[PDB]
Nucleic acid binder design. Structure first.
Ligand SMILES: [K+]
Ligand SMILES: [K+]
Ligand SMILES: [K+]
Ligand SMILES: [K+]
Ligand SMILES: [K+]
Ligand SMILES: [K+]
Ligand SMILES: [K+]
Ligand SMILES: [K+]
Ligand SMILES: [K+]
Ligand SMILES: [K+]
Ligand SMILES: [K+]
Ligand SMILES: [K+]
Ligand SMILES: [K+]
Ligand SMILES: [K+]
Ligand SMILES: [K+]
Ligand SMILES: [K+]
Ligand SMILES: [K+]
Ligand SMILES: [K+]
Ligand SMILES: [K+]
Ligand SMILES: [K+]
Ligand SMILES: [K+]
Ligand SMILES: [K+]
Ligand SMILES: [K+]
Ligand SMILES: [K+]
Ligand SMILES: [K+]
Ligand SMILES: [K+]
Ligand SMILES: [K+]
Ligand SMILES: [K+]
Ligand SMILES: [K+]
Ligand SMILES: [K+]
Ligand SMILES: [Mg+2]
Ligand SMILES: [Mg+2]
Ligand SMILES: [Mg+2]
Ligand SMILES: [Mg+2]
Ligand SMILES: [Mg+2]
Ligand SMILES: [Mg+2]
Ligand SMILES: [Mg+2]
Ligand SMILES: [Mg+2]
Ligand SMILES: [Mg+2]
Ligand SMILES: [Mg+2]
Ligand SMILES: [Mg+2]
Ligand SMILES: [Mg+2]
Ligand SMILES: [Mg+2]
Ligand SMILES: [Mg+2]
Ligand SMILES: [Mg+2]
Ligand SMILES: [Mg+2]
Ligand SMILES: [Mg+2]
Ligand SMILES: [Mg+2]
Ligand SMILES: [Mg+2]
Ligand SMILES: [Mg+2]
Ligand SMILES: [Mg+2]
Ligand SMILES: [Mg+2]
Ligand SMILES: [Mg+2]
Ligand SMILES: [Mg+2]
Ligand SMILES: [Mg+2]
Ligand SMILES: [Mg+2]
Lengths: 101, 24, 150, 50, 76
RNA sequence: ACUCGUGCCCCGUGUGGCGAAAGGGAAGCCGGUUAAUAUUCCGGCACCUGGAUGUGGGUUUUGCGCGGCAACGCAACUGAACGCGGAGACGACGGCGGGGGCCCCGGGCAGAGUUCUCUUUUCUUCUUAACGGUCUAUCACCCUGGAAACAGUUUGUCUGGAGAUAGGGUUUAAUGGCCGGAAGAGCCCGACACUUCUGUCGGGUCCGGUGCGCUCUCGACGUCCCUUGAAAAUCCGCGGGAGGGAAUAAUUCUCACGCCAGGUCGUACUCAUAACCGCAGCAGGUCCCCAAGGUGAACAGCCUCUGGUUGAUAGAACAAUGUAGAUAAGGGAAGUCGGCAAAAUAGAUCCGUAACUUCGGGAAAAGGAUUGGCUCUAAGGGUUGGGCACGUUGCGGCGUGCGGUUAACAACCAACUUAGAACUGGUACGGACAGGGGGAAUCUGACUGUCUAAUUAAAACAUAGCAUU
């Protein structure tokens, strides 16, 4: 088995208290689909939180980073933060939230 | 081969012979 | 202010059509001073001239209909316009079948399940309209070897 | 057409060097009667015969 | 352009009157070293995998030849 | 050869020019650059012809190379007069197979659109030139051997004692795989500088599948003719054996590398509801190349992407009479010279089909039935595996001696075409587009073809057949 890790960094909105991680961690748990179904997150996906406004994800199956980016935008749209925050890839397997100008 | 091609080769031989004479 | 020259120069530098060139509405005076190709490039880098994206044309409905027909959903009698031979020509059906039947006989003869005298006789039977498909040929071979056993 | 011969090229050169107005100082000479150019030609008006 | 197989022939090529210049290109992603010499009619390329002979080869070249290093993103 | 042009010696059947920017024909590709040119300028990397020529290699000690049974191979590897041969060099149509480009499907990394709800979602980029090296690819040819219980074999019946099947080889033909060219280029993201002058730096630029698909090109087959489908310049091979040449040098070695040069004229732009011809910025006329998605048999009609237009004097009102588009109760040609105009029929599947006839037709004769949506069922294919006993080889892969025909099994992969059943609806379903009215007879020309450009397309002309001079 091969394990992949993905990191989402939201330090700036977390420090400004506009984006909270606990709801984001909750949003990922009951939304990610495994084998076509929701709620099948068992011993294949890990959703631990590092704590400093960062979420860490461990996958044992074939998961794609673009899938995670698709979910993050969906969360931002729901909370109506789309006009100030954008999600950008800074390195391999890491996605960061940044403010507009 | 064409005649112009053969004319070049015998022309070179004649020049070389007169030059090697001039050398000698 | 007349900007026809600038729009023509922008399309050449951006490598697009003139219908895809965007000029900043609030910088017309600044854009009008660009007369060379070098100055057009600098205004592109600074973000006053951009290339617009293409218009949407998706095949979602197209490939949705294709999948529904793989399980027989939109192929009734009220959905056909050409003739049967136009949709599936008979000459293609015949050509496929002969290649299938001739491929089998070479396989059996090479392994050893039949000999050349039975191979030749079955070959000309297949050229005639004897065996309907691959299953019919195989059943005929088994009965032939059963009676040859006695 | 882009394909041209040298004789036709020579003719076209002369036809456009003969298509300018008269200079201004010609009109101030004593006993002058020339007003304009009476042989002006335009590609949309009159066809030159080769 | 033509390829050279061994090292001995490539050294003999560089000892020719019509040898104008030479350069070294290294591809770190695939770990290759390429030696190119510019002659009258052709450009000759020699491909090496290791890196313990590149400097050995470099010092064996004649001293009058000009060798560059092919910087990334060559200016127009 | 000339002392130096003057002079000698051979062959002789024949002896002008113009005429093609679509015929024949030596040689260049990629990236960048301008307000306006570029296969022509800049950078890199090549090629052809002609002319001089030196090194390396090759041949020759008895003079002009070796190898293979053979088809033939190899970096070279003498060859005059005269002669023979090949290339240039050729029709239309039909189905089939290989290759490049386009279209289509699945996965991944980046960026963008939508997000009340749904959608691991929708869209875009992911490229590789000329010129070379190396390994291969139908036809055909060579060696062994000797076929009837005849065999091989195409979608399409051709091939073989004038030598098949089979085993092993040689060779024409890349727009095929890998390498040089070449990632240093081009393209997509991100982060800083910068009045300008100026820019600078990080990442990425992958992996598979499918087909009666469209377009170009190549190959092997076939059909047709009382029709058999250009010439010349130019380039090569061979038969012959004239002349010439070394033993320390010689070499008119079609091998590798090296030196020099390539004059003259055209090249902007349009090619058409405004750049040509029609008196004009005229709804007319005027030869070609490239050719996306959906529906569908389809270059039909209808909608969309790239690219391109928004240009044809306008504003207000809704009388008669018009031009163009349409619908009408009941009757159904009573109108009119005359059914003129309009209406009615129409795709596909399954039934059914007369008189007459030159036996080929008439024939889609005439006349009937079905067709949507959803949930299922069945059929039509490809690839890979097969048990012992010896010896070699970093589970070996095989040199074998065998045994056997799994009462045909297992795993994986992939589009479409056809047939049947249940359920369901204001009985509707080729729902727009697209799309034959039919029958019984008379006159006349056999048929297909042709003409009065601008009032007549016909029973007129031509035609095969027949006869005469
Ligand atoms: K020509
Ligand atoms: K210029
Ligand atoms: K030598
Ligand atoms: K030799
Ligand atoms: K011709
Ligand atoms: K083809
Ligand atoms: K093709
Ligand atoms: K193809
Ligand atoms: K397609
Ligand atoms: K070329
Ligand atoms: K025989
Ligand atoms: K056929
Ligand atoms: K065509
Ligand atoms: K001789
Ligand atoms: K030009
Ligand atoms: K041009
Ligand atoms: K033209
Ligand atoms: K279509
Ligand atoms: K269509
Ligand atoms: K009116
Ligand atoms: K009116
Ligand atoms: K009537
Ligand atoms: K009447
Ligand atoms: K119908
Ligand atoms: K009668
Ligand atoms: K006719
Ligand atoms: K007429
Ligand atoms: K007519
Ligand atoms: K007539
Ligand atoms: K007659
Ligand atoms: Mg048929
Ligand atoms: Mg001529
Ligand atoms: Mg020509
Ligand atoms: Mg030369
Ligand atoms: Mg000879
Ligand atoms: Mg390549
Ligand atoms: Mg090759
Ligand atoms: Mg054989
Ligand atoms: Mg390469
Ligand atoms: Mg790059
Ligand atoms: Mg132009
Ligand atoms: Mg045009
Ligand atoms: Mg017109
Ligand atoms: Mg005109
Ligand atoms: Mg279709
Ligand atoms: Mg009006
Ligand atoms: Mg009316
Ligand atoms: Mg009525
Ligand atoms: Mg009625
Ligand atoms: Mg009635
Ligand atoms: Mg009518
Ligand atoms: Mg009918
Ligand atoms: Mg009838
Ligand atoms: Mg007639
Ligand atoms: Mg008339
Ligand atoms: Mg008429």
């Amino acid at each position: 088995k091969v394990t992949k890790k993905f990191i989402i960094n939201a330090s700036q909105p977390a420090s400004d208290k506009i984006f909270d991680v606990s709801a984001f961690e909750k949003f990922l748990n009951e939304r990610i689909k495994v084998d076509g179904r929701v709620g099948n997150l068992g011993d294949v996906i890990k959703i631990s939180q590092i704590g400093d406004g960062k979420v860490e994800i461990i996958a044992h199956n074939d998961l794609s980073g673009r899938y995670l980016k698709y979910l993050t935008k969906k969360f931002l749209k729901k909370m109506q933060l789309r006009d100030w925050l954008r999600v950008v890839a800074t390195s391999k397997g890491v996605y960061e939230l940044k403010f507009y100008n | 081969m064409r005649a112009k091609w053969r004319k070049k080769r015998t022309r070179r031989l004649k020049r070389k012979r007169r030059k090697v004479r001039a050398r000698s | 202010v007349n900007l026809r020259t600038q729009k023509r120069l922008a399309a050449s530098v951006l490598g697009c059509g003139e219908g895809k060139v965007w000029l900043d509405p609030n910088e017309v005076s600044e854009i009008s001073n660009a007369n060379s190709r070098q100055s057009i490039r600098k205004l592109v880098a600074d973000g006053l001239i951009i290339k617009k994206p293409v218009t949407m044309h998706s095949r979602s409905r197209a490939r949705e209909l294709n999948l529904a027909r793989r399980i027989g959903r939109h192929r009734g009698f009220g959905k056909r316009k050409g003739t049967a031979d136009a949709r599936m020509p008979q000459q293609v059906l015949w050509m496929r079948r002969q290649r299938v039947l001739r491929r089998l006989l070479v396989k059996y003869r090479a392994s050893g399940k039949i000999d050349k005298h039975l191979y030749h006789e079955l070959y000309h039977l297949a050229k005639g309209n004897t065996f309907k498909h691959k299953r019919a040929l195989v059943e005929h071979i088994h009965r032939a070897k059963a009676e040859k056993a006695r | 057409p882009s394909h041209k011969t040298f004789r036709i090229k020579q003719k076209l050169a002369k036809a456009q060097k003969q298509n300018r107005p008269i200079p201004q100082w010609i009109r101030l000479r004593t006993g002058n009667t020339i007003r304009y150019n009476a042989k002006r030609r335009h590609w949309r008006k009159t066809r030159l015969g080769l | 352009p033509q390829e050279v197989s061994d090292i001995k022939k490539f050294i003999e090529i560089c000892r020719r009157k019509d040898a104008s210049s030479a350069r070294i290109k290294k591809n770190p992603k695939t770990q290759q070293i390429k030696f190119k010499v510019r002659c009258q009619r052709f450009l000759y390329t020699l491909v090496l995998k290791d890196s313990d002979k590149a400097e050995k080869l470099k010092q064996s070249l004649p001293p009058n030849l000009q060798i560059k290093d092919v910087p990334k993103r060559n200016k127009r």
